[PDB]
Amino acid sequence: EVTPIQQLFLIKELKPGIARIGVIWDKNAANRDEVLPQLQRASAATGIKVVVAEVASLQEVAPQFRTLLRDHQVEALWVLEESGLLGQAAARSFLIKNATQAGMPVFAPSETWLKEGACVTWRKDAEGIRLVVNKAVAEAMGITIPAKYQDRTAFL
């Protein structure tokens, strides 16, 4: 319900100064032909380079994440959905741990990720976007809340 471009405009204010972000995308997720071109348009619009690494199985997760970190030096990890591989505990755990140990915040699709260490997720209420934040991790990572959302932010 929060579109990819809305999400990336939020990320710009949540981690100000970010210039490069990595997306781990499940090759078996629905809507690739919509989402992946939208991410490139979101990149041009926000000024944040978006690098996508696609994965189909758990053995692809580690090598594809390392490519995001060493080849592209991304500054955060962004996960857009969790219907399949990215809803499995082992993939979630691996991605949060390795992002965090590289100094990267994780922007995540659901509160399950926050319960495990991701920083921010989002929802769309009748009054618009509302932010859900892992207070402990977000404070450590230097996450900043845009003024418009100061009153529309819940802590896990």
Numbering used by the authors: 27 to 182
What does the paper say about this structure?
Typical SBP proteins recognize a substrate using two α/β domains, whereas the single-domain substrate-binding protein from Rhodothermus marinus (RmSBP) has a single α/β domain. The crystal structure and flexibility of RmSBP have been established, but its molecular function is unknown. Recently, radiation damage to the selenomethionine-substituted single-domain substrate-binding domain from Rhodothermus marinus (SeMet-RmSBP) was investigated. Global and specific radiation damage from four datasets collected by repeatedly exposing a single RmSBP-SeMet crystal to X-rays were analyzed.
Therefore, the diffraction intensity and radiation damage were not directly comparable, and the diffraction data were collected from a single crystal by rotating it 360°. The diffraction data collected from 1, 2, 3, and 4 X-ray exposures of SeMet-RmSBP crystals were designated Dose I, II, III, and IV, respectively. For the Dose I dataset, images 1–6 were missing. Accordingly, the number of images for Dose I deposited in ZENODO is 354, and the number of images for Dose II, III, and IV was 360. The resolutions of Dose I, II, III, and IV of the structure factor and coordinate deposited in PDB were 1.50, 1.58, 1.68, and 1.75 Å, respectively. Doses I, II, III, and IV were 1.46, 1.56, 1.63, and 1.70 Å, respectively, showing improved resolution compared with the previous report (Doses I, II, III, and IV were 1.50, 1.58, 1.68, and 1.75 Å). As previously reported, with an increase in X-ray exposure, the diffraction limit and I/sigma of SeMet-RmSBP tended to decrease, whereas Rmerge, Rmeas, Rpim, and B-factor tended to increase. As the X-ray exposure time increased, the negative electron density map at the Se atom site of SeMet concomitantly increased; however, a negative density map for other atoms in SeMet was not observed. The results indicate that the Se atom is more sensitive to radiation damage compared with other atoms.
